[PDB]
Amino acid sequence: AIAKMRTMIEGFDDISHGGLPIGRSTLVSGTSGTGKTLFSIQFLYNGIIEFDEPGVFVTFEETPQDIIKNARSFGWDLAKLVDEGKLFILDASPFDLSALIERINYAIQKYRARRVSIDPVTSVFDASSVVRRELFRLVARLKQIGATTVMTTERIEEYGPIARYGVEEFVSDNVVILRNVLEGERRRRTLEILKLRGTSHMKGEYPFTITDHGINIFPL
Amino acid sequence: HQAIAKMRTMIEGFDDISHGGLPIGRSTLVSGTSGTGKTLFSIQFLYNGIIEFDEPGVFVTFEETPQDIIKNARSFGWDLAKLVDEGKLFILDASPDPEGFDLSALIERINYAIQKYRARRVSIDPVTSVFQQYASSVVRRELFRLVARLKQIGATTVMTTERIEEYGPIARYGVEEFVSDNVVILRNVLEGERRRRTLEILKLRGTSHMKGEYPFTITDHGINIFP
Amino acid sequence: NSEHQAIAKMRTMIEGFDDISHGGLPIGRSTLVSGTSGTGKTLFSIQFLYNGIIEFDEPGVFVTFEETPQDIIKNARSFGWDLAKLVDEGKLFILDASPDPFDLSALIERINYAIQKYRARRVSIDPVTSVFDASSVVRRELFRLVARLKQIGATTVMTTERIEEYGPIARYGVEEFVSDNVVILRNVLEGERRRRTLEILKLRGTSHMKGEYPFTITDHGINIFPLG
Amino acid sequence: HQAIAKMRTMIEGFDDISHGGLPIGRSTLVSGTSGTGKTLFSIQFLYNGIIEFDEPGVFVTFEETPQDIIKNARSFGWDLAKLVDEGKLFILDASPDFDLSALIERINYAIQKYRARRVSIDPVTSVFQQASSVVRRELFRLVARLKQIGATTVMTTERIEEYGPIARYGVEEFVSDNVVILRNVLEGERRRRTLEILKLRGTSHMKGEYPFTITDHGINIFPLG
Amino acid sequence: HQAIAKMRTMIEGFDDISHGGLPIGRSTLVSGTSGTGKTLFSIQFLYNGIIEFDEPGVFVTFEETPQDIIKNARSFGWDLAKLVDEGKLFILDASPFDLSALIERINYAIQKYRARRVSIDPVTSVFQASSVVRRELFRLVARLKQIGATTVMTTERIEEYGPIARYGVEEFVSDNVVILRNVLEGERRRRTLEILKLRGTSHMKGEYPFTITDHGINIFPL
Amino acid sequence: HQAIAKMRTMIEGFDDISHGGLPIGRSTLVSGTSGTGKTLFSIQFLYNGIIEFDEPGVFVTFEETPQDIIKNARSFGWDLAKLVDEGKLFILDASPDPFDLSALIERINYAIQKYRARRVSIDPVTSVFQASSVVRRELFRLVARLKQIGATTVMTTERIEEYGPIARYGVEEFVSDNVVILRNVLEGERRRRTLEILKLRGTSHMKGEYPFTITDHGINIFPL
Numbered sequence A: 001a002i003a004k005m006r007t008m009i010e011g012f013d014d015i016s017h018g019g020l021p022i023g024r025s026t027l028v029s030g031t032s033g034t035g036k037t038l039f040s041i042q043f044l045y046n047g048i049i050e051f052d053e054p055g056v057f058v059t060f061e062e063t064p065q066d067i068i069k070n071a072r073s074f075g076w077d078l079a080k081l082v083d084e085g086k087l088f089i090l091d092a093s094p095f096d097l098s099a100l101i102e103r104i105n106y107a108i109q110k111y112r113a114r115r116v117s118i119d120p121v122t123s124v125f126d127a128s129s130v131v132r133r134e135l136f137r138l139v140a141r142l143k144q145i146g147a148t149t150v151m152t153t154e155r156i157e158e159y160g161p162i163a164r165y166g167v168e169e170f171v172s173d174n175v176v177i178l179r180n181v182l183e184g185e186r187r188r189r190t191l192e193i194l195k196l197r198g199t200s201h202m203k204g205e206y207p208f209t210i211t212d213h214g215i216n217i218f219p220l
Numbered sequence B: 001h002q003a004i005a006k007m008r009t010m011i012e013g014f015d016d017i018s019h020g021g022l023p024i025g026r027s028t029l030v031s032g033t034s035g036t037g038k039t040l041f042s043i044q045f046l047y048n049g050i051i052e053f054d055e056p057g058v059f060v061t062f063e064e065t066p067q068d069i070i071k072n073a074r075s076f077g078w079d080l081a082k083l084v085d086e087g088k089l090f091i092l093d094a095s096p097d098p099e100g101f102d103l104s105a106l107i108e109r110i111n112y113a114i115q116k117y118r119a120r121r122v123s124i125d126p127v128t129s130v131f132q133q134y135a136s137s138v139v140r141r142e143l144f145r146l147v148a149r150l151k152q153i154g155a156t157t158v159m160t161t162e163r164i165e166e167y168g169p170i171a172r173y174g175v176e177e178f179v180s181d182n183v184v185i186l187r188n189v190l191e192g193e194r195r196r197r198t199l200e201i202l203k204l205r206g207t208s209h210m211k212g213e214y215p216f217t218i219t220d221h222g223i224n225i226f227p
Numbered sequence C: 001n002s003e004h005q006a007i008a009k010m011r012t013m014i015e016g017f018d019d020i021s022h023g024g025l026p027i028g029r030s031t032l033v034s035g036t037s038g039t040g041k042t043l044f045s046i047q048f049l050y051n052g053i054i055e056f057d058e059p060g061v062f063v064t065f066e067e068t069p070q071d072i073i074k075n076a077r078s079f080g081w082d083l084a085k086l087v088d089e090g091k092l093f094i095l096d097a098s099p100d101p102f103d104l105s106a107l108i109e110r111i112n113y114a115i116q117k118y119r120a121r122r123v124s125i126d127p128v129t130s131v132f133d134a135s136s137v138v139r140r141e142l143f144r145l146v147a148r149l150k151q152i153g154a155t156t157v158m159t160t161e162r163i164e165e166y167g168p169i170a171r172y173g174v175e176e177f178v179s180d181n182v183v184i185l186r187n188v189l190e191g192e193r194r195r196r197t198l199e200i201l202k203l204r205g206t207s208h209m210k211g212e213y214p215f216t217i218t219d220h221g222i223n224i225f226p227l228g
Numbered sequence D: 001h002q003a004i005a006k007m008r009t010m011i012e013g014f015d016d017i018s019h020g021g022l023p024i025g026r027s028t029l030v031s032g033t034s035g036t037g038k039t040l041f042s043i044q045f046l047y048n049g050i051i052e053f054d055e056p057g058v059f060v061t062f063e064e065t066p067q068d069i070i071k072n073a074r075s076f077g078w079d080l081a082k083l084v085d086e087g088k089l090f091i092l093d094a095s096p097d098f099d100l101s102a103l104i105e106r107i108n109y110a111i112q113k114y115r116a117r118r119v120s121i122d123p124v125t126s127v128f129q130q131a132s133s134v135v136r137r138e139l140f141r142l143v144a145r146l147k148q149i150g151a152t153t154v155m156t157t158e159r160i161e162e163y164g165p166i167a168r169y170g171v172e173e174f175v176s177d178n179v180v181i182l183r184n185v186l187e188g189e190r191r192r193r194t195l196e197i198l199k200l201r202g203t204s205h206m207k208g209e210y211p212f213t214i215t216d217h218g219i220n221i222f223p224l225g
Numbered sequence E: 001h002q003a004i005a006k007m008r009t010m011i012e013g014f015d016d017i018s019h020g021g022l023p024i025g026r027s028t029l030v031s032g033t034s035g036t037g038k039t040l041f042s043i044q045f046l047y048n049g050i051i052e053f054d055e056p057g058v059f060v061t062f063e064e065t066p067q068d069i070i071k072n073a074r075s076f077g078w079d080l081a082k083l084v085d086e087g088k089l090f091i092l093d094a095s096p097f098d099l100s101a102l103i104e105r106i107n108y109a110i111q112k113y114r115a116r117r118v119s120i121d122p123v124t125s126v127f128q129a130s131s132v133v134r135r136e137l138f139r140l141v142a143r144l145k146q147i148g149a150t151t152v153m154t155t156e157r158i159e160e161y162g163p164i165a166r167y168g169v170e171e172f173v174s175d176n177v178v179i180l181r182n183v184l185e186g187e188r189r190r191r192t193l194e195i196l197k198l199r200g201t202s203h204m205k206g207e208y209p210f211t212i213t214d215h216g217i218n219i220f221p222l
Numbered sequence F: 001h002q003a004i005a006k007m008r009t010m011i012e013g014f015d016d017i018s019h020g021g022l023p024i025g026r027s028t029l030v031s032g033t034s035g036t037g038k039t040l041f042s043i044q045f046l047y048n049g050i051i052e053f054d055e056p057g058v059f060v061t062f063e064e065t066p067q068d069i070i071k072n073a074r075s076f077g078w079d080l081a082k083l084v085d086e087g088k089l090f091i092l093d094a095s096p097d098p099f100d101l102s103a104l105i106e107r108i109n110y111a112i113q114k115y116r117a118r119r120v121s122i123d124p125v126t127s128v129f130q131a132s133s134v135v136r137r138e139l140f141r142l143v144a145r146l147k148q149i150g151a152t153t154v155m156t157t158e159r160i161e162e163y164g165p166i167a168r169y170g171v172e173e174f175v176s177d178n179v180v181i182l183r184n185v186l187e188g189e190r191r192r193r194t195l196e197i198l199k200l201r202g203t204s205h206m207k208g209e210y211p212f213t214i215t216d217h218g219i220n221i222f223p224l
């Protein structure tokens, strides 16, 4: 079948029927504070700690120092991983996609990375046609490189377009939606795997919490 | 000159819903949100043509590489690599440059493959890419040309397109369903926190079909619809 | 037709429609027929011409803007209608204004020439939407078309597209105001089932039944069921 | 020194709902979706004025030809050609084959020539269809000139939703002294016609929707208390 | 020195809801769809100031002529012509934009009539970019404040439960906001008044039903 | 392991919901429709800092004048003029007169140094921008500079719907480290005020809406 890499994010590998397909790109979309960055960091962190698979984290707005500081509260020492050459945080603050792809490819080769997180890829972008065009090019090259990639995207409603530009979910191999739904006056976080090309997966929404240990999903 | 004939898809349940299959020599639009089964439907159409009727097929891919189309079909126990090695399936790669729109050129290429592989079935996935660059009025007219030129070749064609809501416009520009002869809608609807897949034949010009939505699942044997 | 109404009508002979319209379509006027995709717009317009020819020997002109004459003819065989025979006999003319795989003045003259040449009493234009970008220019051009057909004395069915079952009548928000008569075909999806209805929204100068009436499309074309 | 007085429409039910009729010397906007009875309301207003009170009328049409107006009015038992012949009704044809100032002067000569007290303009929308700021200013000017002339005027406008904007540009209902809304509501596959007086500046009226039908004798509105 | 003082409207029910009336020396936005009672409220504010407190008023009108304002107020048994003749009320005709000039005219009228109360109806007429609307309205509000007027400014809106005014900014530069609604439900209309906000002071919350009668606005406590 | 430090607002109920207060050295977006208590929250933040912890504060105003801000705070029994006199509070008047972001930042930096304030409120930050993508770039720049200074900052923003976009341009909530939403929901003719902490990067907080009232004592939130 299709080989999958384990995220080791509690509950997620069950929902994805074994993890994220190796060598492919997964879109992780959500409104603000849904857990996008956390998912993308946990993906790299677990890869390093449990499988010694090095990772590249690409950030467009949040600084490397804040990413590191924020991860500290889950008890994750990212600076240590950076110091040991197992993690590389690529600062993409200030669009030349060619330059970005070359920088990513270089980091991947230099750190021998198997896992890549790009957070958020919507910061790369104004017509739908060109967004789709340029996103496709990024996805295609990471595939050629053989990276397994998480790309986060922003969205503005819980039920509504998958991402900002109405094309991102059609270009990605895999699509994960993080929701933070307000019901009555209470928030409930859920994760859904909408699509995984070429393989089976659990369907619909599953509740999760963010705790001191990161994302915890219960597929029941 | 006779009331339009149909070719069996052999996709279980679909030939009942369509009262005989897809109208021959015409295009059928298959529209749906992400991960609804559009590529799968279009592959299963060709695969069944080859296996059940020894009718060769041409698959036109605009985004996925042929290798990924092949890989993704293994999930269903379909050996597309062998079908390609045998000359029964041809995957026409129209996907673009990773490292660096002419419609009649595409038609030229499709027509050539159709003649070379003696193909009776064609899939184009996703059609959206043809009209991707541009106004609803422009999209409309470009889809019109493609449909017409495919009809001239005699191809029976499945063409897929995208939509972003389960119960909103048929496709993206609000014109695709008016230019198409035949329209199928794949939905993936939330009920509670669970999903329910359905297939609808909205229209088939000049012929009959069952109405409304019918539930289906995607399994290890592909699409399974229950009328 | 009931006697005490101001506007003379011609019968469509479409089962149930002449009841709902209280006698048929107003003579010498245009009737807008709008609907989402696959609602029966072309079928209604063809059935109007076919019945006119078959029942009253009234010749008809069909103006098609996207479907080819060959496909209109082919699809009509679904109903056991031999339109090629009527074209051969000079009783039906299909005017092909469909795109090569907009000059309205030239179009009107083609239509006029065909109507004179074939001595046609019934005209169908399918879809008039394709004639058209500002709502104001759509309105005056539609108005111009309607006025010329009226001067010519034709009785016309003009189909238009719409994208929601309940929502705008046509595409530009003006078509239903310029037309004398408005018919809406719906194909409502509810609880995973489709049901077709026809509504006569307005008919200037006469009464008509109000609201939605069910219909089906079968081997014999449109069948409408008027209810109390 | 008195609060504004009203002119009877003699449209069944309407003079009750408006507590006496349309405010005299002012314009009333009558808005509705397609086939709601706007032209009917605006004709019935003139027709009743002539028949019941010998008050001459001017009808300004921007789309429908005078011939079709006259023909369609026979549906309601009205012989408008006879009224035109007697010089009690004048139909001013402003329909297309827009200088508003010029049109206003032409309306004024008719009003003077036929000594009209009642005016209908149908639809005042089509004047405008070629910026809301411009629509507002031009409508205001037309309303003010009619008021100066002393006419009591019905102005129809189009709208595209039963329970949405009052008219097309989101400004008509603010520059009008009086607003009437004709609806044609579709519920459970049946249509229900209703009439509402939304506002009459400086005077009272009944509130909300009242059901009506169109008959061989025109509009019949049904109040109930 | 103190929390802000209020000036009584004497509009039945309103001084209760607002716990004393309108904040003195400030502007209150009064927003509403067509025929909600905006003009009536702004007239009744001036009329009561004159009749009850001998506080002169300036009414700024942008579309309705002074003659029609006066005529329409007869519906309530108010003789505004008399008050204008006595020098207690001035109807400033800004009918059929230079905001600086308008403001100097208002200032001139306030000085001339020693007015304490001002109504501007509708202030949206001044603006027919949301960014320029915001800056113009803020400028108008600040000058009125500097002059010392207590002001009612009405605005149009097009939905009962949508944006507060037309440009999506008017409620943010106003110190005080009142919304008049005329909600259609099951074929019946129901008028309500709501005090949405009064900066730096208290007020009752939500919608209160009111009617317009022969004697003006009556607000009922629910 | 290592927790994000927070400074107490001492606003009744808020420090419970935020599990300790606002993240120190960062900006917290406080968004809401008109009259939701945005300015009051901003002021109470600074006021409580001075009164309870002797932490000086800088209030940056963009429309309301200092005199009106002072006048309105009297509603709650707070004497801000006295605090300005004692050099404990500085009101930075950037309000209109009848836009250079770098100058403003330098003005704020100078005031922060001069008064050695730990707490800053910018009300409303929307006035800085009024294209969504340039708004995003500008707001980011402001957040970064304030962070560079070490200020703990409340930034208010406007929104026009109770359950729509967090703020006006659909980007402000993505650039901010922390996001608080004040709502004033109209249901069945009655209004209900609620506060929600939507997001605090790097740290925990209670979820959903909590009802509050505005009274003579300012904001009172009920975590129930």
Ligand SMILES: Nc1ncnc2c1ncn2[C@@H]1O[C@H](COP(=O)(O)OP(=O)(O)OP(O)(O)=S)[C@@H](O)[C@H]1O
Pocket (backbone or CB within 6 Å): A030, A031, A032, A033, A034, A035, A036, A037, A038, A039, A073, A074, A210, A211, A212, F173, F174, F176, F177, F198, F199, F200, F201, F202, F203, F204, F205
């Ligand atoms: N130690 C913790 N314990 C509990 N919840 C935490 C903890 N750390 C962070 N969180 C929660 O996780 C959220 C942050 O998740 P992120 O992954 O940063 O979200 P995000 O979707 O990337 O949001 P952006 O980029 O700001 S739009 C915070 O808003 C908290 O609710």
Ligand SMILES: Nc1ncnc2c1ncn2[C@@H]1O[C@H](COP(=O)(O)OP(=O)(O)OP(O)(O)=S)[C@@H](O)[C@H]1O
Pocket (backbone or CB within 6 Å): A169, A170, A171, A172, A173, A194, A195, A196, A197, A198, A199, A200, A201, B032, B033, B034, B035, B036, B037, B038, B039, B040, B041, B075, B076, B218, B219, B220
């Ligand atoms: N063996 C399998 N069993 C069950 N479901 C499967 C299996 N293989 C694939 N799927 C499902 O099929 C979906 C993929 O269907 P596709 O036909 O590729 O969808 P699509 O509509 O073409 O989506 P795009 O092109 O990426 S937007 C996956 O998201 C899975 O849910």
Ligand SMILES: Nc1ncnc2c1ncn2[C@@H]1O[C@H](COP(=O)(O)OP(=O)(O)OP(O)(O)=S)[C@@H](O)[C@H]1O
Pocket (backbone or CB within 6 Å): B177, B178, B180, B181, B202, B203, B204, B205, B206, B207, B208, B209, C035, C036, C037, C038, C039, C040, C041, C042, C043, C044, C078, C079, C217, C218, C219
């Ligand atoms: N023999 C038949 N029996 C039953 N239904 C039929 C038959 N032939 C055609 N139909 C139906 O009629 C529909 C076609 O109606 P049309 O008149 O072509 O619609 P249309 O409104 O003109 O749609 P367009 O032009 O494609 S948007 C098909 O989608 C079928 O559902």
Ligand SMILES: Nc1ncnc2c1ncn2[C@@H]1O[C@H](COP(=O)(O)OP(=O)(O)OP(O)(O)=S)[C@@H](O)[C@H]1O
Pocket (backbone or CB within 6 Å): C176, C177, C179, C180, C201, C202, C203, C204, C205, C206, C207, C208, D032, D033, D034, D035, D036, D037, D038, D039, D040, D041, D075, D076, D214, D215, D216, D217
């Ligand atoms: N004798 C009658 N009995 C009952 N209803 C009638 C009769 N005559 C006409 N009608 C109705 O009156 C409607 C037309 O009324 P109009 O006043 O023309 O409406 P309208 O709002 O002006 O429509 P426009 O201008 O075409 S959008 C028709 O659609 C019929 O429903």
Ligand SMILES: Nc1ncnc2c1ncn2[C@@H]1O[C@H](COP(=O)(O)OP(=O)(O)OP(O)(O)=S)[C@@H](O)[C@H]1O
Pocket (backbone or CB within 6 Å): D173, D174, D176, D177, D198, D199, D200, D201, D202, D203, D204, D205, E032, E033, E034, E035, E036, E037, E038, E039, E040, E041, E075, E076, E212, E213, E214
């Ligand atoms: N004597 C009265 N008795 C009852 N209601 C009355 C009386 N006089 C006027 N009204 C009502 O008051 C309304 C007019 O209120 P206004 O204050 O003019 O509203 P408005 O919001 O200013 O409307 P505009 O400016 O036309 S959008 C009328 O539509 C009547 O419903």
Ligand SMILES: Nc1ncnc2c1ncn2[C@@H]1O[C@H](COP(=O)(O)OP(=O)(O)OP(O)(O)=S)[C@@H](O)[C@H]1O
Pocket (backbone or CB within 6 Å): E171, E172, E174, E175, E196, E197, E198, E199, E200, E201, E202, E203, F032, F033, F034, F035, F036, F037, F038, F039, F040, F041, F075, F076, F214, F215, F216
């Ligand atoms: N003493 C008080 N008692 C009760 N409520 C009060 C008191 N003082 C003020 N308020 C309320 O506080 C609100 C003002 O809150 P603000 O913080 O000024 O709101 P805001 O969100 O900044 O509004 P803007 O800036 O005008 S959009 C008023 O509308 C009153 O409802």
Ligand SMILES: [Cl-]
Pocket (backbone or CB within 6 Å): A189, A208, A209, A210, A211
């Ligand atoms: Cl959580």
Ligand SMILES: [Cl-]
Pocket (backbone or CB within 6 Å): B197, B216, B217, B218, B219
């Ligand atoms: Cl499934």
Ligand SMILES: [Cl-]
Pocket (backbone or CB within 6 Å): C196, C215, C216, C217, C218
């Ligand atoms: Cl049917």
Ligand SMILES: [Cl-]
Pocket (backbone or CB within 6 Å): D193, D212, D213, D214, D215
């Ligand atoms: Cl009726």
Ligand SMILES: [Cl-]
Pocket (backbone or CB within 6 Å): E191, E210, E211, E212, E213
């Ligand atoms: Cl009332």
Ligand SMILES: [Cl-]
Pocket (backbone or CB within 6 Å): F193, F212, F213, F214, F215
């Ligand atoms: Cl409160």
Ligand SMILES: [Mg+2]
Pocket (backbone or CB within 6 Å): A036, A037, A038, A119
């Ligand atoms: Mg993030």
Ligand SMILES: [Mg+2]
Pocket (backbone or CB within 6 Å): B038, B039, B040, B125
């Ligand atoms: Mg696909």
Ligand SMILES: [Mg+2]
Pocket (backbone or CB within 6 Å): C041, C042, C043, C126
């Ligand atoms: Mg058709």
Ligand SMILES: [Mg+2]
Pocket (backbone or CB within 6 Å): D038, D039, D040, D122
């Ligand atoms: Mg009319």
